[PDB]
Design a protein around this ligand. Structure first.
Ligand SMILES: *[C@@H]1O[C@H](CO)[C@@H](O[C@@H]2O[C@H](CO)[C@@H](O)[C@H](O)[C@H]2NC(C)=O)[C@H](O)[C@H]1NC(C)=O
Ligand SMILES: *[C@@H]1O[C@H](CO)[C@@H](O[C@@H]2O[C@H](CO)[C@@H](O)[C@H](O)[C@H]2NC(C)=O)[C@H](O)[C@H]1NC(C)=O
Ligand SMILES: *[C@@H]1O[C@H](CO)[C@@H](O[C@@H]2O[C@H](CO)[C@@H](O)[C@H](O)[C@H]2NC(C)=O)[C@H](O)[C@H]1NC(C)=O
Ligand SMILES: *[C@@H]1O[C@H](CO)[C@@H](O[C@@H]2O[C@H](CO)[C@@H](O)[C@H](O)[C@H]2NC(C)=O)[C@H](O)[C@H]1NC(C)=O
Ligand SMILES: *[C@@H]1O[C@H](CO)[C@@H](O[C@@H]2O[C@H](CO)[C@@H](O)[C@H](O)[C@H]2NC(C)=O)[C@H](O)[C@H]1NC(C)=O
Ligand SMILES: *[C@@H]1O[C@H](CO)[C@@H](O[C@@H]2O[C@H](CO)[C@@H](O)[C@H](O)[C@H]2NC(C)=O)[C@H](O)[C@H]1NC(C)=O
Ligand SMILES: *[C@@H]1O[C@H](CO)[C@@H](O[C@@H]2O[C@H](CO)[C@@H](O)[C@H](O)[C@H]2NC(C)=O)[C@H](O)[C@H]1NC(C)=O
Ligand SMILES: *[C@@H]1O[C@H](CO)[C@@H](O)[C@H](O)[C@H]1NC(C)=O
Ligand SMILES: *[C@@H]1O[C@H](CO)[C@@H](O)[C@H](O)[C@H]1NC(C)=O
Lengths: 421, 63, 98, 99, 50
């Protein structure tokens, strides 16, 4: 830190980062009577005394089941039109093969989507035969892939206009210039360095693919969701093997060995214990559903604000200055590819608050005053582009004495040679 | 129309879906918006009761 | 006694204080640049002028009224310290958690 | 209100306000058998008939315990560099002694 | 039963605190590390810094 020193980047780095967010969990459904009693009818008659517990559990599980589909629809089905990429995949040198759909794959999935699917993976029958059933999602995987492809094609061809209304086509370099102006850098910076930016973007995409491929813990969240669900189901099944204060953990033996007056006692112990286990399963399911709903809402907000437009919020759509994002589908979740602009190669200068000339103070309209040691110029804050101080880029407000630390220098007038000649 | 969840149609207008066996509904190739969700991309509606693959949305090719 | 134990936090108070001090130093010396990349130093009056431009007021307003703004900020800091000291219900949420 | 009139501020006031937000709660872990039965062996034997209740409780408490540390890490550890203030605490008249 | 009641209350309060911590992290990232245009997000009035 100093008092008259400033630092200005003379370069930039296009960095792409990944963000993984769970969206939906496994839709499960329980049969209260089959789990608690099974085949035996006397248990079902005794179970009826305890009231409407089974109805409450079924209703709660149905609520979670519909909430999962609602979450998926909210996150992905945000466009009522499906767009298709043009047949000619040329966008001014930019490469999108790694994220665009692959016709060769029967699943019609992008290579990154295929890698994500592959990296996320008699127990199943053991769970199913006891009255626990999993339900298929309403939206198949290929439908989610189709939604993501439509969003990606829209954001490539039309920029952010398709999100806020009808789709208006824009050449990709011009959309690039718009997004560069979004972060405070003028268009000529992009237009002169188009090839370098394209090469950096391609290298970042390749590095992202390799990083996802070569790291096992990248997709920890979705695998954790799957593991939690499977572990809860397995724990629930295991509870049937517990005697639970009775003489035998199998109901048929109790029925066949004992007289009704004490058979009822034994089945009461089993019934109350199994009710407690089922209620525990339901309550943890409800809490996990609430957590995943919060995550899904966050994912939907991220999609709407980073994919369908450019966001000014810091660290919301990736580290650095945000440019766009690209969505990718994953099992039970969504993966974002945030494209950001990162300054680099800073260089260190001498600055002054205002320039005193003819007893008047001049202040930059949009830039800052920098000095390389003998001369003064005006530059953009986020990129070093020295320019002659004129009256076009400076405005006058008051005299030189009020401001502290003013420095003398001449102010060139563009009109001066014009009326001089 | 009744749906047998997670049961093949040979163990019970018969249509086989990933969700299960559907009885009483006729499958139609045309696509529409989802009216009564069934699962695995199949939705049912009344027009008799028909079962169809839900339509994602109207296609729009930007030039 | 009865089988219940409290576990120590992974981050001690000193290291959290160190993190807060680092954030304060970064935002004092380098503005908002350190958040979005490498840290670039900026004289504090110029950062104040930038943040004034953020809210739609030109830079000369900040530059001509520097002493008044500094005095107002210092008075506000004194007042907030006194307000925290003199009110018992200010820290209600953390004590409520405990 | 009117048709052709406006109010323009001519002067300002710099205001500083507080905001308090809880971040983490005290990490707690329990021993199921010691609490429920103490040193009696027969109680532990009868407790064993219920099965994996104690395991579930320990797992839930462990999840909460790790979530607390994750919360603190998310809130505070957002910078990978430990910057330091310059020795001379002059910033154009702005005074940061209290912070 | 008592132990399960304690655990359930702890889980609900943990959800409370996690929501609060997410809000605090967002406030830090958007008001401390930058200047925010969101009204009342970073204090009453026009925001300058935090
Ligand atoms: C700004 O940085 C870029 C790299 O980000 C520099 O471009 C590199 O230049 C060297 C030598 O000319 C090449 O070998 C590299 O291949 C270039 N990078 C890429 C990604 O192709 C550029 O020279 C720098 N410019 C200034 C003025 O510092
Ligand atoms: C865009 O990138 C893809 C892959 O990143 C390029 O496809 C590669 O092309 C070379 C030569 O044709 C092959 O050796 C590689 O095996 C291809 N990679 C893959 C993953 O198939 C492609 O050439 C680039 N440019 C365009 C215009 O698509
Ligand atoms: C601009 O000038 C300052 C001051 O001369 C440079 O700060 C020095 O950087 C070196 C490199 O790490 C350190 O060893 C010195 O200790 C720094 N000086 C002080 C006073 O701490 C600064 O690095 C320069 N900017 C650039 C981009 O090089
Ligand atoms: C600061 O930058 C200015 C502008 O680039 C430099 O002025 C030019 O410097 C080059 C090389 O030194 C000369 O060939 C030109 O004739 C100069 N132009 C004018 C109008 O004088 C200046 O030299 C730079 N100062 C330092 C210390 O690098
Ligand atoms: C910037 O330029 C102004 C005007 O040329 C300087 O003000 C003059 O300074 C000299 C030397 O101190 C005095 O003799 C004159 O009376 C001043 N004129 C006025 C109108 O005040 C000023 O000193 C220069 N600043 C620097 C830092 O060199
Ligand atoms: C804007 O408000 C400030 C105070 O908020 C005014 O400054 C005060 O001015 C009077 C007389 O000049 C002094 O007695 C006070 O001590 C000043 N306050 C402070 C905090 O220093 C200022 O005059 C106002 N501006 C206008 C144009 O009315
Ligand atoms: C910054 O603020 C501190 C405290 O708000 C000021 O320190 C005070 O200085 C006076 C005069 O030396 C003492 O009477 C007080 O006891 C000090 N306060 C404390 C808390 O120690 C300090 O003067 C202000 N300015 C600078 C440049 O530090
Ligand atoms: C400008 O900075 C230096 C170094 O921090 C400081 O010592 C000097 O006093 C400052 N200028 C003024 C007029 O205070
Ligand atoms: C001015 O205001 C009056 C009442 O507030 C209203 O009747 C009138 O229409 C306004 N002037 C014009 C030109 O509309």
């Amino acid at each position: 830190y100093s008092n008259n020193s400033i630092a200005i980047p003379t370069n930039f780095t296009i960095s792409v980062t990944t963000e993984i967010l769970p969206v939906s969990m496994t839709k499960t459904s329980v049969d209260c009577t089959m789990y608690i009693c099974g085949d035996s009818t006397e248990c079902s008659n005794l179970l009826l005394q305890y009231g409407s517990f089974c109805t409450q559990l079924k209703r709660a599980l149905t609520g979670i089941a519909v909430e999962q589909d609602k979450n998926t629809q909210e996150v992905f089905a945000q466009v009522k039109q499906i767009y298709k990429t043009p047949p000619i995949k040329y966008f001014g040198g930019f490469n999108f093969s790694q994220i665009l759909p692959d016709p060769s794959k029967p699943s019609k999935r992008s290579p990154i989507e295929d890698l994500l699917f592959n990296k996320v993976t008699d127990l199943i029958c053991a769970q199913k035969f006891n009255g626990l059933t999993v339900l298929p999602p309403l939206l198949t995987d290929e439908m989610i892939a189709q939604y993501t492809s439509a969003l990606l094609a829209g954001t490539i061809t039309s920029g952010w206009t398709f999100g806020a209304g009808p789709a208006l086509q824009i050449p990709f370099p011009m959309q690039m210039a718009y997004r560069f102006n979004g972060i405070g850098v003028t268009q000529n910076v992009l237009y002169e360095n188009q090839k370098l930016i394209a090469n950096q973007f391609n290298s970042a995409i390749g590095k992202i693919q390799d990083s996802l491929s070569s790291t096992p813990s990248a997709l920890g969240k979705l695998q954790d969701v799957v593991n939690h669900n499977a572990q809860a189901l397995n724990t629930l099944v295991k509870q049937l093997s517990s005697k639970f204060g009775a003489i035998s953990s199998v109901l048929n033996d109790i029925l066949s060995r004992l007289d009704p007056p004490e058979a009822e006692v034994q089945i009461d112990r089993l019934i109350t214990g199994r009710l407690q286990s089922l209620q525990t399963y339901v309550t943890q399911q409800l809490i996990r559903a609430a957590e995943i709903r919060a995550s899904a809402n966050l994912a939907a907000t991220k999609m709407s604000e980073c994919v369908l437009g450019q966001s000014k919020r810091v660290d919301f759509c990736g580290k650095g200055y945000h440019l766009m994002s690209f969505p990718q589908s994953a099992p039970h979740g969504v993966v974002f590819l945030h494209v950001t602009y990162v300054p680099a190669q800073e260089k260190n200068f001498t600055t002054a608050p205002a320039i005193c000339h003819d007893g008047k103070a001049h202040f930059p309209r949009e830039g800052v005053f920098v000095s390389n040691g003998t001369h003064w110029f005006v530059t953009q804050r986020n990129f070093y582009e020295p320019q002659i101080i004129t009256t076009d880029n400076t405005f006058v407000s008051g005299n030189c004495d009020v401001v502290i630390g003013i420095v003398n220098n001449t102010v060139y007038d563009p009109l001066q040679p014009e009326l001089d000649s | 129309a009744v749906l047998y969840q997670g049961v093949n149609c040979t163990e019970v207008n018969v249509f086989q879906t990933r969700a299960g066996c559907l009885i009483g509904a006729e499958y139609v190739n045309n696509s529409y918006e989802c009216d009564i969700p069934i699962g695995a991309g199949i939705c049912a509606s009344y027009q008799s009761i028909i079962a169809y693959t839900m339509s994602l949305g109207a296609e729009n090719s930007v030039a």
